[PDB]
Amino acid sequence: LLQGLQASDESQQLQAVIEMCQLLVMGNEETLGGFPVKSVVPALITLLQMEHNFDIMNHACRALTYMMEALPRSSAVVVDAIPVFLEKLQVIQCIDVAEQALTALEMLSRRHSKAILQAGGLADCLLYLEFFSINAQRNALAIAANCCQSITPDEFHFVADSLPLLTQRLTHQDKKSVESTCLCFARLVDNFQHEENLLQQVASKDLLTNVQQLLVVTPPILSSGMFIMVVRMFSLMCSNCPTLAVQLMKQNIAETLHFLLCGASNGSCQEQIDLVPRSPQELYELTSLICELMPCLPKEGIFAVDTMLKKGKDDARAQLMKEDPELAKSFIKTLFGVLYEVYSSSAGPAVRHKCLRAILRIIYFADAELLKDVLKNHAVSSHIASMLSSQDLKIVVGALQMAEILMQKLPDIFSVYFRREGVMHQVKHLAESESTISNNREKIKGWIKEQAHKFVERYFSSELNVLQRLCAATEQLNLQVDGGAECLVEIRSIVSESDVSSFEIQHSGFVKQLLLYLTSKSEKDAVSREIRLKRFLHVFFSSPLPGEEPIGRVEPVGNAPLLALVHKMNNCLSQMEQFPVKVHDFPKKHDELWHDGVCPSVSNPLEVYLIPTPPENITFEDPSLDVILLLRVLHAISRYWYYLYDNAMCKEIIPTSEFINSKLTAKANRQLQDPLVIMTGNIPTWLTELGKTCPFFFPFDTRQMLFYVTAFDRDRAMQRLLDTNPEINAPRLDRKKRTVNREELLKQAESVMQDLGSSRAMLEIQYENEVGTGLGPTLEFYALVSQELQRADLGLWRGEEVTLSNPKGSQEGTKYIQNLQGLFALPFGRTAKPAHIAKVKMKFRFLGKLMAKAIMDFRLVDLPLGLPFYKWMLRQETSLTSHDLFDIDPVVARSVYHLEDIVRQKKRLEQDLQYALETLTMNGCSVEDLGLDFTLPGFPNIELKKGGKDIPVTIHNLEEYLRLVIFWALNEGVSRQFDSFRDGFESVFPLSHLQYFYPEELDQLLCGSADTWDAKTLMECCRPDHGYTHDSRAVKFLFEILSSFDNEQQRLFLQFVTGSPRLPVGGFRSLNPPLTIVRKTFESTENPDDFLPSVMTCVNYLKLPDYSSIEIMREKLLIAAREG
C-alpha cells in the first residue's frame, strides 16, 4: 500500500492513507511482520508536510500514531518525525492534528524524552496547551514531565521559558495533569541539586507558593504516592540551597506542616494534637523537610561520633536565626509539637532516627530563653530516659547529646527534671556498665561510657519528697504487714493529685507490691484476700468495706481514682516498654441436679486472673513484664468485680477502651502491615501472647486485624491486609461451584455446608440459572439464610413472634422471631422427645458451621444474637448469673431479682425465725402466693428436678429454686444444643482463636454497625467525571440525598450502584475502581425529569440525568434501585 502514499493526485494519497491506516490498525506485530517502516515514515512525514489539505495531514499523523502500537520495534524510526511533529505544534493549522501529534509524542516520551528535549520540544508542546482538550493536555504534560527528567544541567534554557507555564499548572484541577506537573519539577530538582544557580531559578516565588497551597487542599488533589515526591522535592532543595530553605521559612512553611500533621489548624494550641493518619513513608518525608529547615549540626565537639553512626559553608540558615530572630521563634514555637507527637506516636526504625535528629537541631540552635518557652509543656525529661535505656545504638547516643546540651543551656531546670525522671540514674548506669560493622559498635560503646562518665562528673557528682512517700507506702503494702485502710489512701493521694515520675513508681518497688498485694494466696498474710480486695475497691472505686455492705445494691459513683491509676500505670508501661518491632525496612453419675436439685456452683472468673506469676502462655522477657501483669489484674478487677459482692451491678468499673495502650496500639499497627512478616508467618511472639492474655491493650480494629492473620494459612491473611490498606499493589485460592434454589433455601444450605467446611477454600453461591453472579449472590446468601434461621416453626429461639414486611418475596413470612434484647436458644427438659431434640441439634450444628464459615471467607451475617449467647461461644458459660438472665428473658428477670431480695432478706434474719419466713411478702405476696413449682416460668413442660412440678417452691427451697431457675434457663436447658454448636464450630476452625475478643464485641465481628454516610466522605471518595464537577447541580443534589437514608436505602443504593448491598472494607475508599458519577446523555426532545439513572456495576458508574429539582432525583433513585 506504499506507493499510493507516493501518488501525485492529492485525493489519491488521501484515499491511500486510510488504506495505510487500517493495514496497521487492525494488524499487530505478529501479523504485520515485514512492514517496511523505513519507507512509510518518510512517506507519512511527506504527507504530513502537505499543510494545505488537513485531511491528508490528519490521517497521516494517525498513521504514525498507530505504527508503534503495531510495531514496538519501529519506534526507533518514528523519532525522525519529531521536528515535523513539533512543526504542527509550533504553528497550528489543524487542531485535530495538533491533538493527534501530542499523543504521537506521549508514546515517544517513554523512550525518547531526550530527543524531544534536544529538539527543543518542551517549549513547543506546552505552547498552545491552553487550547487542547483534556486527553491532549494530559499527553503534553506527560511529555513535559518526561522531558524534565534526563537533562544535563547545561540545558536549562529549554525549561526556562516554560517555567511560568508549569508554575500555573499547579493551579489546575485535572488530577492526571497536576500529577504530571509535579513529576516535572521533582525531576528538575533531582537534576539541579548540584547547582544553586539554576535551583534558585527553578524555585520561583510562585512555585513555592502554589506547591505550598497545593498540599493544604482538602480533598487531596495529589495522590498519597505523589504527596511523597512533592515533599521530597523540598528536601533536595533545602539541603543544597539554604536560601530557598530561608525562603521557605519566609513563606510560612509552619502553617503548612502544622495543617498536614496536626489536623485542622484550629487556632488554639492543641494539647492532644490529633495526627492525620499518614503512612510510614510520608512521615519520613514530612520530617526530612523539618530536618533540613534548621541548621546543620557540627562535626566536632560532642557530635564527633556522628561520623561513625553513619558508617553502616557559612550557612544562611545559621545567619537566618541571627538575621531574623523572630522567624526562628515563629518556626519553632509551633512546629516543635509536631516533632514531639510524630516521634512519640509511630514505631518506625528510620522515622525515629529522623524525628530524633531534628530535635537535636532545634535544641542546639535555640538559645536559652527559647527552650524554656518551647519545652514548657512537653515532658522531654522522662522521654529521654526511655531513649537512654534503649538497646539501640543511635537512640542512646542521641539521648546523650540531648542530655549534654539541655544541661548546658538550662541547668537551672533540667537538674531537677533529670533526677526526678531517671536521667541521672540511667546515664550513671551507662557509665558504670562494662559488658567494619563489628568494629564500630564497641567504639560507640567506648564513646558512650566515657561520655556518660564526663556527664555525671560534670553535673551529677554533687549529690525527693515524693520518692520518700512512695518508697515508704510501698512497704505498707507488704504481704506480712497489716497496713490498715490508709496505706492505700496515701496512694490514692500520691497517684491522683501529686506528680509522680515513671522512675519513682518503677523503682520504689510499687509494681510488684501491688501485684502481690492483690494476688496473694497464702495464710501467712496479715489480711486475707477477701478483705484486701474490698479495701482496694474502697480506695479506687468507693465500694463499701468488708462488713459495711448496705441493704441496697452496691452503688458505683465514679471510677476516677482507678481511672487515674491505670493511666499512670500505663504511662509506666509506655516508658519501660522494649518490645521489638521486626519491620523489613525499605528506606451412674449421680445427677444431683435431677435427683436432688444441686446446681454446680457459680465459677468466679476472677480467680484465674488473680495469680502473681505470669500465665504459662507468656514467654516474652520484658523490662515492663511486671507492669503488664498488674494491668491484667487491674483489668479483671475493673470488669469482673461484681462477683466479690452480692448485689453489685453488671456495670464494670472502667470501659475496656480506656485500657488501650496508645504506644502498644501503635507498635502493633506498624507490625501488622509488613508483608514479609505474614507470608512467612513469623509474627513476633510478644504480639500474639499479649493479644490473647491481655486483649484490653488494643482497640477492636487491631485485635480484629490481628485475628485474621494469626488464625489461618499463608493465604487468607494477606487477603485481609489488602482489604484494609490497598496501597501495596491475592494468592492462589479455590472456589468450588455450588448451585442454590431461592425456595429450597434452608435444605440446600445444610447440604452445601455438609461437605464444604473441610477444605480451606472459599464458598461459591450461585443461584439456579440467574444472570447476577459473583459477590452478589454470596453476600445475599448469608442474608437469606439468616433471614431463614429466625423462623418460628424451627423452634430454636426465644422471644416474641412478629410477622414483618418480607421484602425478599417470601410473602408467607412464616412469623419471624424478633427479640428486643437478642435471640438466645430454647430450653429442653428431660420431658422432650428424642426426635424433637435431634432435629434441633442439626440446626445448631448448622448454625455453628454457618458462623465459622462466615468468618473464614470474611462475610457477614445479620443475626441479632443476645449477649449471653456469645459467652457460651467463648466458653464462659460456667459464670452466668442473674445479670445474664436479664439479657435473655426480660420478664422472668424482674421476678428473679425481686425474689433474691427475699433470699437476701432470708439470710438477714436467719443470722439473728420460722414465723419470719412466712412474713416475707413481696408486694403483699409470699412465696406460695406466686404458687410457683420447680418448672421454668414460661416453659411449663420442663421440670427442674425429678418430679419438681409436684414439689411446691417454698421458703425452704427458694434458695434452691433461684439457683435452679438460673441454672436451667441459662446453663442446663440450653446445654444440649450448644454441645453441638461448639462442636460444629470447631469442625473447621477452633473456638480458642476467638478468645482475642469479648462477649460484647463479637456482635461487631459478624454484623458491623453501617459506615460513613455524610457528604464530606462522599466528596472525597466519589469521582464526578465526563460532564460533572464537585460543584455541579446534580452532584450537589445527589450527595445531599445520600446523607438522608435509613440503613436499608443505603443497602438499596449500593445494590443498584455497586452490585452488593453493603460497603466493602473501609468506607467508600476501597471501591475498585471508585464511584464514578457521569451525566447521562439524551437528545433535544427529551425532558430528563422522566427517566431513570441506569448504571453499569462492573466498573461502578452512575449515569445520572440532571433532574431539575432535588425531590425528583429523590424519587427516581428509589424506583430505579428496587427494579432489579
Binding site: 488537513f54 490528519n58 497550528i92 489543524c94 487542531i95 485535530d96 491552553e130 487550547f131 482538550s133 460543584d1031
Partner: protein, 76 residues
C-alpha cells in the same frame, strides 16, 4: 456581564452574556461577529470542552473568564 474568548490566531473578543444563555446561543454569537459555522466551533474552558446543551452558569463561568475556540474539520 461579559466574557473573553481567544482563538488560534490571537484575537480576543468580548461577548455580552449572563449566567444563562446556552452554548448554541453564544456560539451563534461567534458567527454573528466572526462568521464561523458552528459545525466545527469547539469551545474549550480549562481543558474541558463545552457540549451543546449546558449553559454558562452550569460551567461556572465568572466575569471576563478566558476560554478558547477551536476549528475541527468533520471528525469526532
Amino acid at each position: 456581564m461579559q466574557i473573553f474568548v481567544k482563538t488560534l490566531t490571537g484575537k480576543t473578543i468580548t461577548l455580552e452574556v449572563e449566567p444563562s444563555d446556552t452554548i448554541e446561543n453564544v456560539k451563534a454569537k461567534i458567527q454573528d461577529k466572526e462568521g464561523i459555522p458552528p459545525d466545527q466551533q469547539r469551545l474549550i474552558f480549562a481543558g474541558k470542552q463545552l457540549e451543546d446543551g449546558r449553559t454558562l452558569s452550569d460551567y461556572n463561568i465568572q466575569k471576563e473568564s478566558t476560554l478558547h475556540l477551536v476549528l475541527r474539520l468533520r471528525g469526532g
